[PDB]
Design an enzyme around this catalytic site. Structure first.
Site, short mmCIF file in Angstrom:
data_model
loop_
_atom_site.label_atom_id
_atom_site.label_comp_id
_atom_site.label_asym_id
_atom_site.label_seq_id
_atom_site.Cartn_x
_atom_site.Cartn_y
_atom_site.Cartn_z
N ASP A 25 0.77 -1.23 0.00
CA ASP A 25 0.00 0.00 0.00
C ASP A 25 0.81 1.29 0.00
OD1 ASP A 25 -2.02 1.88 0.29
OD2 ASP A 25 -2.73 1.08 2.22
N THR A 26 0.90 1.93 -1.15
CA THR A 26 1.63 3.18 -1.24
C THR A 26 0.84 4.29 -0.54
OG1 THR A 26 0.56 3.70 -3.36
CG2 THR A 26 2.62 2.40 -3.42
N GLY A 27 -0.40 4.01 -0.14
CA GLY A 27 -1.22 5.01 0.54
C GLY A 27 -1.27 4.88 2.05
C1 LIG Z 1 -2.72 7.62 7.63
C2 LIG Z 1 -2.55 6.34 6.80
O1 LIG Z 1 -1.55 6.17 6.11
N1 LIG Z 1 -3.55 5.45 6.87
C3 LIG Z 1 -3.59 4.17 6.15
C4 LIG Z 1 -4.81 4.16 5.22
O2 LIG Z 1 -5.93 3.94 5.68
N2 LIG Z 1 -4.58 4.32 3.92
C5 LIG Z 1 -5.65 4.36 2.94
C6 LIG Z 1 -5.66 5.74 2.29
C7 LIG Z 1 -5.65 6.86 3.31
C8 LIG Z 1 -4.47 7.73 3.50
C9 LIG Z 1 -4.54 8.77 4.38
C10 LIG Z 1 -5.72 9.02 5.10
C11 LIG Z 1 -6.85 8.23 4.95
C12 LIG Z 1 -6.85 7.16 4.08
C13 LIG Z 1 -5.52 3.27 1.86
O3 LIG Z 1 -4.20 3.27 1.31
C14 LIG Z 1 -5.75 1.90 2.44
N3 LIG Z 1 -7.12 1.72 2.87
C15 LIG Z 1 -7.05 0.41 3.53
C16 LIG Z 1 -8.27 -0.50 3.61
C17 LIG Z 1 -8.38 -1.12 2.22
C18 LIG Z 1 -9.09 -2.45 2.18
C19 LIG Z 1 -8.43 -3.44 3.13
C20 LIG Z 1 -8.46 -2.89 4.54
C21 LIG Z 1 -7.75 -1.55 4.60
N4 LIG Z 1 -7.99 1.82 1.71
C22 LIG Z 1 -9.18 2.41 1.74
O4 LIG Z 1 -9.60 3.05 2.72
C23 LIG Z 1 -10.04 2.23 0.49
N5 LIG Z 1 -10.97 1.11 0.66
C24 LIG Z 1 -10.94 0.04 -0.12
C25 LIG Z 1 -11.88 -1.11 0.17
O5 LIG Z 1 -10.18 -0.05 -1.09
C26 LIG Z 1 -10.79 3.53 0.12
C27 LIG Z 1 -9.83 4.70 0.01
C28 LIG Z 1 -11.55 3.33 -1.22
C29 LIG Z 1 -3.67 2.97 7.14
C30 LIG Z 1 -3.76 1.63 6.41
C31 LIG Z 1 -2.47 3.00 8.09
#
Ligand SMILES: CC(=O)N[C@H](C(=O)N[C@@H](Cc1ccccc1)[C@@H](O)CN(CC1CCCCC1)NC(=O)[C@@H](NC(C)=O)C(C)C)C(C)C
EC number: 3.4.23.16
Lengths: 99, 99
Positions: A25-27
């Site tokens: 996850d680059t995010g």
């Molecule tokens: C601050 C930070 O880096 N938060 C990460 C994070 O949630 N990253 C999100 C994007 C993000 C960045 C900054 C603030 C808020 C959100 C993203 O890379 C990963 N998440 C993780 C979910 C994905 C599905 C498995 C369980 C974890 N992705 C999502 O929230 C996405 N949901 C899905 C189902 O893809 C959404 C952005 C569409 C945590 C995993 C530590």
């Protein structure tokens, strides 16, 4: 390797003598692992995502092998449905986004 | 371009004639942008991630430019803490992870 994004980029990681699946996850600033007991002391911490925050346990200096590539760093352990390898570890294996 | 991950991979995107900063997120299945009015009919949707689910507006076939690459796809708009470019559009621009 080169990883396309047609599907979620899930790869095999190894922590101790355990193999697991994890999302590259680059995010994610941090690495979040599914609930597991690791030895050592930890610090409680709050991490935020798209819907709000969750509480996790922070362990420092954990070695994780990502596709045969070692990385050592901070990992947060919480009730996530999937292991997430964040930027703190991806930079260590020389991982880049290319287009 | 080759983007390293020592910092969040934020790029400038152009949508609705506006320039915005967004994160190239391989951990996201969808593309979510902060509240903004876009042309066209939208429909309500809920998406989840760490911390919970959020209500968003779904706009289909929106043109968006990412570093000079045109993409036409689905864009969700809602209370996201950061503008996110998910896999649905990263594939259109030929983006991969490499290490
Ligand atoms: C601050 C930070 O880096 N938060 C990460 C994070 O949630 N990253 C999100 C994007 C993000 C960045 C900054 C603030 C808020 C959100 C993203 O890379 C990963 N998440 C993780 C979910 C994905 C599905 C498995 C369980 C974890 N992705 C999502 O929230 C996405 N949901 C899905 C189902 O893809 C959404 C952005 C569409 C945590 C995993 C530590």
């Amino acid at each position: 390797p080169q990883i396309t994004l047609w599907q979620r980029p899930l790869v095999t990681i190894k922590i101790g003598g355990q193999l697991k699946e994890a999302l590259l996850d680059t995010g994610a600033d941090d690495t979040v692992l599914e609930e597991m007991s690791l030895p050592g002391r930890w610090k409680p911490k709050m991490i935020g995502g798209i819907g709000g925050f969750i509480k996790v346990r922070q362990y420092d200096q954990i070695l994780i092998e990502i596709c045969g590539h070692k990385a050592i760093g901070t990992v947060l352990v919480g009730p996530t449905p999937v292991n997430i390898i964040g930027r703190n570890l991806l930079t260590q294996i020389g991982c880049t986004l290319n287009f």
